[PDB]
Amino acid sequence: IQVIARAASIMRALGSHPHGLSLAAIAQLVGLPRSTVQRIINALEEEFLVEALGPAGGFRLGPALGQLINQAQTDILSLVKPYLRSLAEELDESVSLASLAGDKIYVLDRIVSERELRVVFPIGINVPAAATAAGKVLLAALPDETLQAALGEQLPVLTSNTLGRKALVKQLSEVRQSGVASDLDEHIDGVSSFATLLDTYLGYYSLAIVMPSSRASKQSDLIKKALLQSKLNIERAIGR
Amino acid sequence: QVIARAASIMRALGSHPHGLSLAAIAQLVGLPRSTVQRIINALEEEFLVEALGPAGGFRLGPALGQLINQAQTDILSLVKPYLRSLAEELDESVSLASLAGDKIYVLDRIVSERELRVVFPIGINVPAAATAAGKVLLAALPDETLQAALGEQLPVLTSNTLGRKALVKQLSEVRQSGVASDLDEHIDGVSSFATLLDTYLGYYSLAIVMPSSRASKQSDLIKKALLQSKLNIERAIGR
Amino acid sequence: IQVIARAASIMRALGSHPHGLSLAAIAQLVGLPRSTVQRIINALEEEFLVEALGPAGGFRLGPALGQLINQAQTDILSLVKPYLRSLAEELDESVSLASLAGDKIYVLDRIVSERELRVVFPIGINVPAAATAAGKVLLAALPDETLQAALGEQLPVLTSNTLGRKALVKQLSEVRQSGVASDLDEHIDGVSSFATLLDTYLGYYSLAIVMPSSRASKQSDLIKKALLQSKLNIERAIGR
Amino acid sequence: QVIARAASIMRALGSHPHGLSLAAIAQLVGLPRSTVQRIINALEEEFLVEALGPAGGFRLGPALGQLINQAQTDILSLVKPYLRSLAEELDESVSLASLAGDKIYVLDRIVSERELRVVFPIGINVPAAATAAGKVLLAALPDETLQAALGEQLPVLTSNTLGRKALVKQLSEVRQSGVASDLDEHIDGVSSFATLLDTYLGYYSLAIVMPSSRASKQSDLIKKALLQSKLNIERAIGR
DNA sequence: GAGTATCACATAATGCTACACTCTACCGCATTACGATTCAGC
DNA sequence: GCTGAATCGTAATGCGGTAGAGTGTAGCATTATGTGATACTCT
Ligand SMILES: [Os+3]
Ligand SMILES: [Os+3]
């Protein structure tokens, strides 16, 4: 139950240097004496959780891993839902997770709060990226290269607060300094949303709080710090 | 040496993807509930397993998946783009799969955004003797090894599944044409086509999996698409 | 624990004759002697679960009921989800509940099966009624009057199997004889769906199985009988 | 006389909409767990309560709601259409509410299909001293009873909520104009407007509840709509 | 530098056995609610 | 007639103790379990 923390640390090491590692290098990446690494590695190899890289110095990750993946340990739906319910429970504001498809984010899933003053929206609906905060965050994450493939010629305006390409980018340069994006009625009148980026081993996703700008004025600091905490949790559990 | 235990536990969980309880797990492996308990926690500490809600539940953890994008952050880190383009073109569900025993180890997939889609999880294991990717992966194998990989009555996952001789037959055809087909042999209603990827990194199979309603309609343009993709790829990693 | 079944039966009686009932009439609607009804009614009145209709003969339902409704015993979402999970668990085919809005049904909620060959669709999306089975069922439920307000002039075709107004109605006259509607690719190629009507105290809703026509050919009888059973269950628990 | 128990249980559940356990319930009422148990089942038999999933849970049952569409299948069975039309016209969330004590008993509602909507469950109880429907319902009340309905420091659910004199003031205005308004007095951000429904079936209030972003924009056209609806209705049930 | 075998020590894994917690079940005892009556006002 | 209300001797019925089939968790001896300096092997 405590030699395991060790073997795990080793797993991680081998995932950090997939090309192959000798037990020396392992002994360095973790403050565990050579011999210990020896024995542990042996056990792991025995259970096929690790492979020998030939007579040459090395031990890569084993097939057992793949042998084990089951009924989708890879579906950010069943993988993130827990944390969504968590956040939405903590704030009582509807939340959402969505991917990025060029210029439109895909509402992968959401949770609606049962407040008297609520904000409801579909799931599976393709919506404009530059328009929402989730979008914005998903957008900063992109390269200057693929950026323009999204911001194409002219942005389809949706209100009187929606932004143009000469102000959008302005914002964007900041969501790489703080990491949290914000849309104030820049999609729907009276509706604000606060998002942040989820850098998973599966990819990049958008996690946002969707709310009535009314309450949005009052609660800000707390909500941002929240989304950020949720970010660090999920990131620790499933990031890369 | 306790590791052995932890792992027997792992496997146990894996074999029942829907989830087990300390009780059930401890009955499946010959261990005491308290021991199981300590081990499960010892693993949940590392996201090697997951608690399954307030009611009784335990399943495998995320770390398990995380350590596979890392496992080979090579072939994935370069084939990913090609899979993207090819996934946008045909707009179907693309699958990069390697071979492990009589079943194919799916390294990566991209699901079509279409209404009627077809999914098969990352890693998901399906007998290579019934999926295109599988046939392809078998083709590129020593006439000596490929017989050993079939030392038992082949899987018969469906009705149109193949026999022994029947299989040995196509096994060459696919070597020649370079591609392989699957019509209602893995799952009644599904068809999948695949082409090899002779690379320096090994023998991988690039396949496309789709329903049958859209299969008969256009089988060729698919095969060609796949072949061009294969070419472009092997102009960067071939050997 | 068994005088309660009785008091309940009485509640029901009073809900069947909201204008007011004397204990005689109650004694008839349920095979329980006059005196018993006397006492029980008394207790109920005492807890405000029933009202006296004045010196004149009568006892209506009490305010306590309203005093009790809580956090929405009225939201077919949290009210039907159990039965959805039930059905989808039983068949492994994606299922759905949707309301009727004129000529478009509103996908209120669904459950997706994790089968290799799956059928996925949004939630909140407005889709054509005459096109889907859920629709069809929701449509039979309407009056010849409001019917035309839905079937307006010409139906927006979606494939080569979609029906026209001179064949639709043909079908419709039958979904009032069996109660279960069927759409075979009449919306999306390769996709069939089997629906039935849910006549709740909240209204009419559509409960359907959405599946790949492939499997749909094989499994039919069993699925229909299933949907029908689910129908009777939900109906017993929440119908009117 | 066991009924008393069952009902104390009911109330208990009601007071905690999120759900209780036999344990918790039995602690809230002075009853033994086993007794609670038997009673809970005795009610679940009648959908008067609901099991709340495999983990520990019990909440109120559907029958409770069912017995309200029946409770008064009159005013609902005739006002429903009007509420439909009026709900489609303004495209907002309409509310038919009656009065019970210092709070309004919502008989029916129809939620706007708009993105930013406002819901308040059927029956939901909110102090009439802060919602339009409430003000309206108070207006049509004996100058003798309406004082008794306010025998304590009025609810102060928000910031812009009203005082005693302050309230007694509007209480007449609404009698006159026939309508009543609510600006951030029930819930910061919400506004609601209401008109009475002097009927032979009693005094009901027809209201419309919406955010403030859309309130200031168009307050009048609303009031007028409501008034015409009221008229049409009371041309079929008025007195 | 790879990876491997050895062995004396006490650390660091074990699995008892008890807990807090769901909802459920049994099952004798006297407390409860039952229902043919009689009474009271319309 | 009907409303609904009040007695009152009977045993039936609703009680509530105390035990069970499940979750996951906590403490804590005892002794097996794994540990790591130092010395061995073969590019
Ligand atoms: Os498996
Ligand atoms: Os309440």
C111 within 8 A of C94, measured Cβ to Cβ: yes
CA D183: distance to chain centroid?
18
Q: Are residues B77 and B64 in the same domain?
A: no
| CATH number of residue D176's parent domain | 3.30.450.40
Phi-psi sector, A229: left (phi>0), alpha (psi -120 to 50), beta: alpha
The arrangement of strands across the sheet holding A204-212 comes to: A126-128, A104-111, A95-101, A204-212, A191-199, A180-188
| Angle, CA of B21, B24 and B28, to the nearest 5° | 135
- Do B166 and B112 belong to one domain? yes
C-alpha to C-alpha distance for A222 and D128, rounded to whole angstroms: 33
Distance A72 CA to ligand 1 centre (A): 9
Q: Are residues B84 and B58 in the same domain?
A: no
Tell whether B64 and B85 lie within a shared domain. Answer: no
Of D21, D36, D71, the last residue of a domain is D71
Distance between CA atoms of residues A41 and A60, nearest Å? 10
Domain co-membership, D40 together with D127: no
Residue in chain A lying closest to C114 (CA): A71
Any chain B CB within 8 A of the CB of C189?
yes
Q: How far is CA C150 from the centre of its chain?
A: 20
Cβ–Cβ < 8 Å for A196, A185:
no
The pair of structure tokens assigned to C172 is 């419709």
Residue whose token pair is 């972003």: D213
Residue B133 phi/psi, 5-degree rounding, is: -45, -40
**Which pair of tokens denotes residue C115?**
């089968």
Domain that holds residue B161: 72-239
Same domain, B65 and B157: no
D148/A contact by beta carbon, under 8 A: no
| Tokens of residue B237, six digits | 């990693």
Cβ(B6)–Cβ(B39) below 8 Å = yes
Q: How far is the CA of B61 from the C1' of E6 (A)?
A: 37
Report the alpha-carbon angle B202-B203-B209, nearest 5.
135
What secondary structure does DSSP assign to B151-170, as a single string? Answer: -SS----SSS---HHHHHHH
Q: Which nucleotides along chain E are within 7 A of a protein C-beta?
A: 1-6, 12-17, 21-26, 32-37, 42
Distance CA A51, CA A59 (A): 5
Q: Does B53 touch chain D (CB under 8 A)?
A: yes
Calculate Rg over the CA atoms of chain C. Answer: 22
User: What number of helices (H) and strands (E) belong to chain B?
Assistant: 9, 9
Number of Cβ within a 10 Å radius of residue D82: 18
Q: Do B1 and B57 belong together in one domain? A: yes
Answer whether D35 touches C (CB < 8 Å). no
Residue D60 CA to ligand 2 center (angstroms) comes to 11
Span CA (B81) to C1' (F17), Å = 70
Helix axes of A221-238 and A76-91: crossing angle, nearest 10 degrees: 150
3-state SS record for B57-124: CEEECCHHHHHHHCCCCCHHHHHHHHHHHHHHHCCCEEEEEEEECCEEEEEEEECCCCCEEECCCCCC
For chain C, the helix, strand and coil percentages under 3-state DSSP, each to the nearest 5:
40, 25, 35
A85, A77, A87, A84: which is closest to A225 by C-alpha? A87
Q: CB–CB of D101/D149 below 8 Å?
A: yes
Place of tokens 């919400």: D190
Query: CB D35: neighbour CB atoms within 10 A?
Result: 16
> Which residues from chain C sit within 8 angstroms of residue B119, using beta carbons?
114, 116, 118
**Looking only at Cα atoms, what is the longest distance across chain B?**
59
CA torsion angle for D18, D22, D28, D29 (degrees, to 10)?
Answer: 130
Domain containing A36 — which CATH number? 1.10.10.10
The tally of CA atoms less than 13 A away on the side-chain side of residue A105 is: 27
Question: Is A47 in the same domain as A108?
Answer: no
Q: What single-letter DSSP state applies at residue C152?
A: -
- Cα separation of D55 and D43, whole Å? 19
Residues D154, D147: Cα–Cα separation, whole Å: 11
Q: How many domains does chain C have?
A: 2
CB contact under 8 A, B65 and A46: no
User: What does each C-alpha distance from A192 to A222, B55, D216 come to in angstroms?
Assistant: 15, 36, 19
CA→C1' distance for C65 and F6 (Å):
29
Retrieve residue B126's tokens. 């399906």
Question: Which among D21, D48, D71 is the end of a domain?
Answer: D71
Which DSSP string corresponds to D115-154?
Answer: SEEE---TT-EEETTTSHHHHHHHHSS-TTHHHHTT-SS-
CB contact under 8 A, C68 and D60: yes
> Which residue, B44, B71, B98, sits at the end of a domain?
B71
CB contact under 8 A, B70 and A63: no
Contact check, Cβ <8 Å, B63/A8: yes
Cβ within 8 Å of residue A116, ≥6 positions away: D118, D119, D120, D187, D190
Distance from CA of A191 to the nearest CA of D (A): 7
Do A124 and A88 reside in the same domain of the chain? yes
For chain C, list the contacting chains (3+ Cβ pairs, <8 Å): A, B, D
User: Which tokens go with D68?
Assistant: 């309200």
Neighbours of B2 (CB within 10 A): 16
Quick one: B16 and B96 in the same domain?
Answer: no
Q: Does B187 touch chain A (CB under 8 A)?
A: no
Residue B118 dihedral angles phi and psi, to the nearest 5° = -140, 120
CB contact at 8 A, C107 and C121: yes
CB-based contact A8 B72, cutoff 8 Å: no
Using CA atoms, how far residue D144 sits from B149, C56, D136, D150, in Å, is 94, 28, 16, 11
Q: What is the DSSP letter of C123?
A: B
Query: From the CA of D124, how far away is ligand 2's center (Å)?
Result: 7
Of residues A12, A43, A101, nearest to B3 (C-beta): A43
The residue to which tokens 């909201």 are assigned:
C18
Residues B60 and B84 in one domain: no
- Residue D13 and residue D81 in one domain: no
User: Out of C71, C114, C124, whose CB is closest to A123?
Assistant: C124
A111 bridge partner residues: A95
Closest CA to A91 of A229, A194, A208, A223: A223
Q: Which one, of A213, A210, A202, lies nearest residue A239 by Cα?
A: A202
Residue B162 near residue B154 (C-beta atoms within 8 A): yes
Cβ-based contacts of D119 with chain A (< 8 Å): 114, 116, 118
CA atom of D74 to C1′ atom of F4, Å: 27
Way it was determined:
X-ray
Residue (of D133, D52, D67) closest to D100 by Cα position? D133
Give the CA-to-C1' distance from C72 to E27 in angstroms: 39
Buried b (16+ CB within 10 A) or exposed e, B27-44: ebeebeeebbebbbebbe
C117 touches chain B (CB under 8 A): yes
Token digits of residue B125: 């294991």
- 3-state SS string over chain A? CCCHHHHHHHHHHHHHCCCCCCHHHHHHHCCCCHHHHHHHHHHHHHCCCEEECCCCCCEEECCHHHHHCCCCCCCHHHHHHHHHHHHHHHHCCCEEEEEEECCEEEEEEEECCCCCEEECCCECCEEECCCCHHHHHHHHCCCHHHHCCCCCCCCCCCCCCCCCHHHHHHHHCCCCCCCEEEEEEEEECCEEEEEEEEEECCCEEEEEEEEEHHHHHHCCHHHHHHHHHHHHHHHHHHEC
Please state, as a whole number, how many other Cβ atoms lie within 10 Å of the Cβ of residue D144. Answer: 7
Region of A99 please: left (phi>0), alpha (psi -120 to 50) or beta: beta
Nearest to C237 among D38, D39, D62 (CB): D62
Helix residue ranges, H only, chain C: 4-16, 23-29, 34-46, 64-68, 76-91, 133-140, 144-147, 165-172, 213-218, 221-238
Tokens describing residue B227: 């072949």
- DSSP helix/strand/coil, D98: strand
- State the helix-helix crossing angle for A165-172 and A133-140, rounded to 10 degrees: 70
**Sign of torsion over alpha carbons D79, D84, D87, D90:** negative
CB of A149 within 8 Å of a chain B CB? The answer is: no
